[PDB]
Assembly symmetry: C4
Homo-oligomer: 223 residues x 4
C-alpha cells in the first residue's frame, strides 16, 4: 500500500499521539511485542519479525497466543542477513524445520544492492550491525511502501550503536526517496524527522507476559 | 477418479460387507499386505506404501511376489515426512539407490499446507505421529479422490495414539470437504463415520507368508 | 543414423569378413583399442569409452595419440553407472577435472527405464555387472541406431559372466526392437545371432603399444 | 566496443608512445595498479582483476581509494580458474562474502572451449600456468572486443614461463581471429607483434603507495 507504522519495544510506545495517524495503514511488530499492558496499536499485525538467536521459544509462544485469540498475525519473517560469519547455518537449520517462515534476506533485503553492499562491508571490516527497527524499515521500503511512521524507537535509551542506526536511515532516505515520520513528540527521534501535520488503549487482562519454554525433550532431539 | 478403498492390516479386514462397495474403485495397500490367507480385495493394487524403517527387505519381497504372478502393483510410494529429526537422510539414501520409487511428501503430501504445518508442529513440540492409514487417506485426498472407503483400521486393537489419528481425520474432513465411509459394520470406526446406503474371497495356496531376507553380503556393501 | 559397428578387444577382431559390412556405418571402440597391429576398422572413430577405474592414464595416452595424427576421435564417453556402491563419487571427481568428457548414464543410459531398473536390481541384490560391450550396445540403442554389428566380443574367451551378458542382450532385443548381427563367422557369438546376407588391413609401424604413465608429481597433487 | 588497452605493472608502462593510441578505448588494470607515480592512463578504469591469493587486503584498499576520489572503477573481477587443485574452494569462500564481485571463469572464460581444455590439460599434466596479462586478454576476447593494445607486459623482465605466455597468445590469435598491437616500441613484446601506424602524465601527490592491512580481529572471525 502507501502507509505503514513500524513500532519498537521502547518506553515511548505509550506516548503516541493518535491525531497524527493516517487513515489506512499496516503495523509491524518484532521480538517481545506481547509484553504490552495495553492494546496500543490494536490486535491486527501485518508481519512479525523473530531473530535467529531465539526462535524455537518464540514460535511456540506465538502459536499459543494465536490459539487463545489474542492477536491476528498474517506473516512470520526471519530476520537473517545470510552472512557466513553470523547466522548462515542457523538460518538453514531453522528453515529445514518450518515451512511457513519467510526468510527476510532472500525475499526482500536482497533487492537493495547498494544497501546490502554497505551492510556487508560494515559487518566484515568494522564489526557493526543494525537493530531490528532498521531491518523492518528496509523491508517496508523493499515491499513498496512509501510512508513509514516510526514509533517505539528510543535509540537505546557492542555492535549496535547510534552512529550506524542514524547513518543507515539517512542512506535509505537519500538513495530510495522515501518519507519518514515520527508520531512520538517527546521521543529523541523527533529531532531528526519532522512531525506530521494534524483514543484510549484498552487494558489487557490475564494475558501472557513472559516467554514460554518448550519441554525438556525438545532440546534432546535437536542435539 | 472418484472412489478409492484404503485397507489396513487389522482383524476387521475379513469382515467386509461386499454389498456396500461402489462400482468402480481403486485399492491402496501398505506394509505386510501379502500375509492374507484369502484374496479379500483381489490381486489388483493401485499403489503400495513402504516405510523407510524397513525398505530393502520389502522391495526384494515385492519383486519376488511380482515375478511369481501373485499381485499386479502399479506404483510404489515411500512413506516419508522429510523431517530432519526422523527420516530425512534415510529417504535420500533410499532414493539414491532406486529410480522407480515415488517419494510421498515431495509429490502429494506437500500440497496440503495447513495439514503439513499441523503435522510438523505436533511432531516437533509434542512427539506425536500418525499411522500409515492416515497417510494413505491424505495422499488419496491430495490425488483428487473424493470418496474414501476405510477398512482394516481397528484403531490399535508411543508416538501413535487414538487422539491424533481421530483428530487428523477430522482435520481433513473440515478443511478439504471429502467424504469418509466405513465398510466394516462391526468395526469401532463405524461409530464415527456413517455406513453407506445399500462374494466369497478365494483361498490362497503355497503363498509367501513371511518377509524375505536379503543375502549377507548385501549388508556389507551398505556398511 | 541407421548402422553402427561395435568392436571389442577379443581375438576374433582379426577374423572379420569384409563382404558383410554395410555401406555407411560408425565405429565404436573402448579401452585399449590402440594395441592393434593392423588398422582393422580404419582410423575414424565416432566415440570411445573409458572406465572410471583407470582414466587419467587413458586421457593422457589418447591426447598423445591424437597429437601424432594416428586416430581421429570425435567424442569421449565415461562408462559410469552412477551407482552409489561402485563409482558414484569417482565419476564426480573425474567430471570436476575435465569439461570435454561426456557422462554415459546421464546422457544416454538414463533414457531406458526398464533396463536401468533391471541393472540396478541385479547390481544391488545379486552382485552381477555387465561388460563394456553391452554398455556400448545400450548407448547405441539409446542414440537412435537400429542396426548394430557386433565384433571382437568372444564372451570371455567375478561379477561378469555369460548368463548376464546374454540375458541383457535378449532384454534389449525384446523390449526395444533392434537388430543384432555378427560379422565374425567363427566367433561363438554367431551361434546366437544371424549372419547378414552377402580388404586387407594396413600394417602399423612405430606405433604406441603400451599405456603411458603420467609423471610422479601428478599423483601427489591428487592426494 | 572495438578497442581496449590492457596494461601490466612492468617497467615499460612509463615508456608509452601516445601517438599510437586510438580515439575511443577502455583500460584494464590488475593487482597493484595504484603504485603509479603518475597518471599514465588516466583515472577511468573499465574493470579490475584481483587474484584469489590476496583478496581481502585488496578490496579494502580499493574501497579506501574509491572513497577518496582517486579512481573511478566500474567492475571488479575475480581471476579464478575454478580448478579443483588450485582455487576452487577459495573462490567459493570469497563469493560467499561479497555480492558485487564477478567471477571470471563462470562469466567470460568458460565460453572459450578449446582454450579452456588446453589450459586445463597443461595445468593438470605439466604444472604450467598463465599470468594475469593473458587472463585479461582472454576475457577481453570473450567480451567481444576486437582490437587489443598491450602495454606494461615485459615478459618477466615456477609455473609461469615465457613458453606458455607466448604459446597461449598465438593460440588465441589463430583460433579467434583477433588483432594484437604493442604501444611500447622499446619493449621486447614489439618483436612479436606489429607497431600500429601513426601528452604528459600528471603527477600524483599524497597518494597511497602501499597495500593496506585489515585490523587484527578480521582474521580471527575468518578462522
Amino acid at each position: 500500500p502507501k502507509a505503514v507504522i513500524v513500532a519498537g519495544n521502547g518506553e515511548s510506545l505509550s506516548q503516541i499521539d493518535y491525531r497524527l495517524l493516517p487513515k489506512n495503514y499496516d503495523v509491524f511488530r518484532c521480538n517481545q511485542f506481547y509484553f504490552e499492558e495495553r492494546y496500543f496499536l490494536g490486535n491486527k499485525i501485518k508481519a512479525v519479525f523473530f531473530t535467529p538467536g531465539v526462535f524455537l521459544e518464540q514460535y511456540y509462544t506465538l502459536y499459543h497466543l494465536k490459539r487463545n485469540n489474542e492477536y491476528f498475525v498474517d506473516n512470520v519473517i526471519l530476520s537473517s542477513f545470510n552472512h557466513p560469519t553470523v547466522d548462515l547455518e542457523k538460518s538453514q537449520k531453522i528453515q529445514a524445520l518450518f515451512i511457513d517462515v519467510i526468510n527476510g534476506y532472500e525475499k526482500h533485503l536482497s533487492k537493495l544492492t547498494a544497501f546490502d553492499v554497505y551492510l556487508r562491508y560494515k559487518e566484515l571490516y568494522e564489526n557493526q550491525r543494525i537493530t531490528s527497527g532498521v531491518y523492518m524499515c528496509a523491508v517496508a521500503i523493499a515491499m513498496g511502501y512509501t510512508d513509514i511512521y516510526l514509533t517505539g524507537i528510543d535509540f537505546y535509551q557492542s555492535y549496535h550503536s547510534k552512529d550506524i542506526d542514524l547513518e543507515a536511515l539517512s542512506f535509505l532516505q537519500q538513495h530510495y526517496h522515501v518519507n519518514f515520520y515520527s508520531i512520538s513528540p517527546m521521543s529523541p527521534l523527533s529531532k531528526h524527522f519532522p512531525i506530521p501535520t494534524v483514543f484510549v488503549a484498552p487494558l489487557k487482562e490475564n494475558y501472557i507476559n513472559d516467554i514460554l519454554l518448550p519441554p525438556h525433550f525438545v532440546y534432546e532431539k535437536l542435539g
